[PDB]
């Protein structure tokens, strides 16, 4: 993985010494070649995970997420120099450095072999995101955002650390391959119940589960766009990925304690969706939609069914792409209006036809229009849940319904109407954002064409 | 108001100076060059060439090997009359049953 | 009612208020030497045999 790690690390000196004008160009292009190199990592052996070294390995679950992060890295670079144009060169270089360190930590996380190293980099993603959210944020509760986000993450992270070190003392090693091959049945002891809770609740905090999901409507809504997309697209996937890794040594106990959280998500995905309907801000609506989709992924994880795992992975990838695109579109409109209430600027479909389209298939993919990978990922989870329990369907059946409502509602109330007369700053569509939504959208349908890649390790 | 503060700068659109602005930066030449580099690398060698790559990997999950061994053992077992698959994935004789 | 009221009150705000309230009673000492050494004194026999740390 050092064919991807070493270039990512060496990307830091390039930006840190590039001229006052070349930082954006150089970072964008070289991150694009980094994504190209990581495109190779989609090469997967039939059943054996690709073990590059002792400390680094990859399989059909880590590789798609890694490719997602590496391909994403140019996208924040393209979305940031709009709101980062009027800044000192050193400050811009550090913003870029925060982004590269974030991507590097995500790569080491996804390619980590020992659970402790996975925890180290997984949590270590907090710091660059914290700096991005706090310093470069524009709204008020950004300072409150950082506190909420850090403390919510850590409150689950530390018990996970205690559980992992206890596992190391008892089992012998935290290596994934060992704990899977040398896996042993888990007894229904209450100490084992608390161990399962410690191993689960950190990822479920970052999932998020309903109830303890307040860090997203107070974090993604406030972060700069680059931070917002890197949060929603991948950082949410950290908990799902960790759960998929950890349920190997968390059975057969899970089912007995699967009952509270599963429905907590199942019911929660309704409320969040309902919360999406009666929203006032675009970014908050997208954040709550992300919460609902991630709750569906939670249900997929706790079913522990092959089909559930494949649908889960597909939903993570598709949701990352769709949420990043929706946040980018919201930023474009907000910057054009310097406000975020989704009533101030409506009826812009005529003014910006390409934005009107980009919003149209962004909503369609968010609404999971078949045969997009969003729809197949959702439907696989629906079928797995129905096999696990029939009634789930109606709740599932409710979700996209309400989702569809808001999935079109903002499009009705932001572009499908009459323009506001007193505003005039809406200029011609700068081709930067249009191109950015292109690099968002075309890979989505490309993966729709061949979903065997994002299908996960169960395929 | 006890706080010497400059007035909030106006929201400066890129089109007023060079109409050909691509919304990247002030200077038209480097703005245009960033256009060329993105529209090259994002689409040409990553989106298009990368799509040829992902559409044309080598054997994935050995599914073709799975089929080309599958019909082989169907030929064998169906020809000799043996059931085309065994209810046990492991031979019960070599498995020592407790008690 | 749920998100911005009950969900804030159930976990983040309650813990924040608890820490806020009782960090005040911890850190508002009058700073007098007499009461500090009196507390040291009380801790002496509390650790000595009241908890029976000796045995």
């Amino acid at each position: 993985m050092l064919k991807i790690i070493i270039p990512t690390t060496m990307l830091l000196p390039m930006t840190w010494m590039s001229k006052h004008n070349m930082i954006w160009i150089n970072a964008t292009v070289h991150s694009l070649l980094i994504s190209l190199i990581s495109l190779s990592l989609l090469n997967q052996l039939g059943e054996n995970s690709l073990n590059f070294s002792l400390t680094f390995f990859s399989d059909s679950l880590s590789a798609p997420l890694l490719v997602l992060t590496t391909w994403l890295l140019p996208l924040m670079l393209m979305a940031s120099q709009s709101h980062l144009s009027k800044e000192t060169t050193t400050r811009k270089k550090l913003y870029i450095t925060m982004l590269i360190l974030l991507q590097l930590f995500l790569i080491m996380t996804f390619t980590a072999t020992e659970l402790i190293l996975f925890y180290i980099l997984f949590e270590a993603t907090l710091v660059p995101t914290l700096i991005i959210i706090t310093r470069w944020g524009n709204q008020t509760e950004r300072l409150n955002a950082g506190l909420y986000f850090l403390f919510y993450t850590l409150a689950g992270s530390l018990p996970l650390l205690v559980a992992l070190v206890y596992i190391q003392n008892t089992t012998g090693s935290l290596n994934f391959l060992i704990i899977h091959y040398w896996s042993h049945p888990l007894s229904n002891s209450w100490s084992n119940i608390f161990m399962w809770l410690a191993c689960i609740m950190a990822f479920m905090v970052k999932m998020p589960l309903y109830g303890l999901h307040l860090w997203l409507p107070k974090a993604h809504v406030e972060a700069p766009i680059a931070g917002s997309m890197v949060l929603a697209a991948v950082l949410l996937k950290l908990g799902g990925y960790g759960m998929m890794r950890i349920t190997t040594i968390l059975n057969p106990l899970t089912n007995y304690m699967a009952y509270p959280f599963l429905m907590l998500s199942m019911w929660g995905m309704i409320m969040t969706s309902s919360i999406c309907l009666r929203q006032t801000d675009l970014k908050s609506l997208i954040a709550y939609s992300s919460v609902s989709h991630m709750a569906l992924v939670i249900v997929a994880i706790m079913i522990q069914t092959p089909w559930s795992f494949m649908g889960a992975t597909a939903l993570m990838i598709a949701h990352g792409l769709t949420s990043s695109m929706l946040f980018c579109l919201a930023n474009t409109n907000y910057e054009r209006v310097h406000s975020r209430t989704m009533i101030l600027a409506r009826g812009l479909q005529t003014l910006l036809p390409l934005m009107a389209t980009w919003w149209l298939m962004a909503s369609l993919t968010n609404l999971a229009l078949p045969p997009s990978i969003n729809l197949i990922g959702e439907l696989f989870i629906i079928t797995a849940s129905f096999s696990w329990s029939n009634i789930t369907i109606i709740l599932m059946g409710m979700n996209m319904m309400i989702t569809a409502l808001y999935s079109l509602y903002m499009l009705i109330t932001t572009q499908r109407g009459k323009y506001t007369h007193h505003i005039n700053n809406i200029k011609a569509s700068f081709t930067r954002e249009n191109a950015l939504m292109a690099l968002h959208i075309l890979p989505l349908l490309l993966l729709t064409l061949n979903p065997k890649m994002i299908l996960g390790p169960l395929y | 108001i006890r706080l010497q503060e400059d007035p909030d700068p106006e929201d400066e659109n890129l089109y007023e100076k060079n109409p050909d602005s691509h919304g990247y930066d002030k200077d038209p030449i480097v703005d245009l060059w960033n256009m060329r580099v993105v529209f090259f690398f994002g689409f040409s060698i990553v989106l298009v060439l990368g799509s040829t790559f992902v559409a044309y990997l080598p054997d994935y999950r050995m599914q073709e090997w799975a089929r080309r061994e599958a019909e082989r053992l169907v030929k064998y077992r169906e020809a000799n009359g043996l059931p085309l698959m065994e209810s046990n994935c492991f031979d019960p004789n070599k498995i020592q049953l407790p008690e | 009612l749920l998100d911005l009221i009950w969900l804030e009150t159930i976990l983040p705000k309650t813990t924040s208020f608890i820490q806020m309230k009782m960090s005040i009673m911890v850190s508002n000492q009058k700073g007098l030497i007499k009461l500090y050494f009196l507390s040291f004194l009380i801790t002496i026999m509390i650790s000595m045999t009241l908890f029976n740390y000796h045995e």
């Binding site: - | 909030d8 700068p9 | 960090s23």
Partner: peptide, 26 residues
């Protein structure tokens, strides 16, 4: 223009303690 702290934001913790009570007094 992102919110940069102003005078009233600065005074919220600039003095005695940032958790004022009657015990803080003066």
């Amino acid at each position: 223009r992102q919110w940069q702290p102003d005078v009233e934001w600065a005074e919220q913790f600039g003095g005695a303690v940032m958790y004022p009570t009657k015990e803080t007094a003066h």
